[PDB]
């Protein structure tokens, strides 16, 4: 291990140097930004709090994201004391969260830059299981179902998240000043012999730590490859290549009755470092979505999206239908 | 010259073909192709083709191992008997119950089961509908599983519901009968002693062929960072590397954090092709699978910026 540990350190240094170009290329910077103007001392109150929640454990829901970094912003809902109580007065099992659309356009000027928008809630009900549903205020009159969530009991207050990216993108398109969501308890009912059975504050609503929208978008200053593009175009870079395999013609096998063949495509092509490649084009950028130059020390043209293959074959007199995983290559990536 | 590029591709294509020869055999865990002298000539039986079709059928629904899974299916109890007299005249509810012994014959032991799907032939062509799936936990109760918003489609469509955990629990249970419930979505809200309630021909095909069934994928009976940091492995795996922006990169511009666990993948990916060449590609590499982002805080002049960079932290590695 005397002459192997030192070899390991060279790999670690190779990884570190790739990360140097890795971070700078993501930020679309040739060199680290100038610091002469920066105030010394601790970070501001809003900056630390913004960075805090990005690391915090949140509740998940259950096109692919790009290589370059996303600017994260957040907008807290309109304050509790004003406006949000008179229109929905005394609703026992419904929580309303409305946002100023101009505050969203201040963070994200145009919708095309927005890549993800999350609605955040500070859940408090520790001991009992609850089933909730999320709704979007499309118009002033009706609400539309978005999603639901079965919430198991948790001993500690937990931050809940709802992916409302598609909804917030439509909000950035609209000029209407106020938009919002509605979180209500799950309704369970059933009709039977002309009878009908029906079964049905949770979170911080005021000040800081009230519900908010977390926006991840490409900043304005900075404003994989599936078979549907790899089969049409001839590319020098890493991509999917067609290969139909006949169990008779190519493998000399007769025991697979169904199918007689399938498209087992392969990945083939050079994977240069993303910063070593020409200025970014939409067709070349896709490959690099999971790009981590130092991870494997040498990036390879490997598959991303794969599909299974069901087959039919015999064991004696007995026919068997089986499914094989990861047989069909649908996309390739450099990583 | 394209004459000497055709030849290069043919060599790559043959390497892929030869790896696939080993891939298929290794997934089925066979050393050589099985003997076919006893196989009946002619078309496959009625049930065998139908079972195979549904594996290919295009369906809309909302890690798995390397080796192949045996696919079986079990149709629900027929309409005319037993399943209507206890649920007589339910206007907005469709009931699907299954014999638990038929499931244990298809999947002998619950540990072997890897996936179970409930299949429905949707019929409502023109109208958008919202449905919910329920499980018969007890003799008195049903339990919420999932829901589905169904957009209009001109053609009858096969719907799928992932009921793996439910069907696996059925094999754990000893009760002879189990089943599901598909009902219309209930939307209500109470306000000042008032209450608004909204709901939403047969919804799906219910009798004869193409009736609801469970599609079972299980390992045959005959085939019977938290891991990378503890053990030292020669093969491809995750390797520890903490990176301090000052100590390792010489940087002062990233105020938060001062560093992070950016692990790397390292190890050769040159009978047991599960960790050797899972993808069967011409040259397998040790590349990461699970990646995690890294939020940072830095300054550009006077304006502080908090940004998130994707795929910075390697959590798992694979041979591909
Ligand atoms: C499972 O999938 C295959 C996918 O093709 C299905 O194959 C089709 O089976 C039908 C069965 O009737 C064939 O229809 C035939 O039509 C000709 C006239 O065109 C008639 O002479 C035959 O008597 C038969 O009725 C159809 O051609 C065949 N598909 C292809 C591409 O040939 C199969 O039906 C599926 N499911 C089953 C068998 O339940």
Residue numbers in the entry:
A (entry chain A): 2 to 63, 70 to 207, 217 to 239, 250 to 361
B (entry chain B): 1 to 62, 71 to 208, 216 to 239, 253 to 298, 312 to 361
Task: Quote what the paper states about this structure.
TGF-β protein monomers are biosynthesized with an N-terminal prodomain of ∼250 residues and a C-terminal growth factor (GF)3 domain of ∼110 residues (3–5). However, the GF remains strongly noncovalently bound to the prodomain, which keeps it latent during storage in extracellular milieus. The structure of the pro-TGF-β1 dimer reveals that the prodomain dimer surrounds the GF dimer. TGF-β cannot bind its receptors and signal until it is released from the prodomain (i.e. activated).
The structure contains one monomer in the asymmetric unit; the other monomer of the dimer shown in the figures is a symmetry mate. We also reprocessed to higher resolution and re-refined the previously described, cleaved porcine pro-TGF-β1 structure. Despite the increase in resolution from 3.05 to 2.9 Å, the overall quality of the re-refined model and its Rfree greatly improved. The porcine, PC-cleaved structure has four crystallographically distinct monomers in the asymmetric unit but nonetheless has pseudosymmetry that resembles the symmetry of the human R249A mutant. Four unique monomers are present in re-refined, cleaved, porcine pro-TGF-β1; because chains A and C and B and D are similar to one another, we only show chains C and D in the figures. Residues 252–258 in the mature GF are α-helical, in contrast to the much more extended conformation in the uncleaved GF. The conformations differ among the N termini of the crystallographically distinct GF monomers in cleaved WT pro-TGF-β1. Chains A and C show ordering beginning with N-terminal GF residue 250. Chains B and D show ordering beginning with GF residue 253. Nonetheless, the structural environments of the N-terminal residues of the cleaved GFs are similar overall in having close interactions with other GF residues, and none extend into the solvent-filled channel in the middle of the pro-TGF-β1 ring.
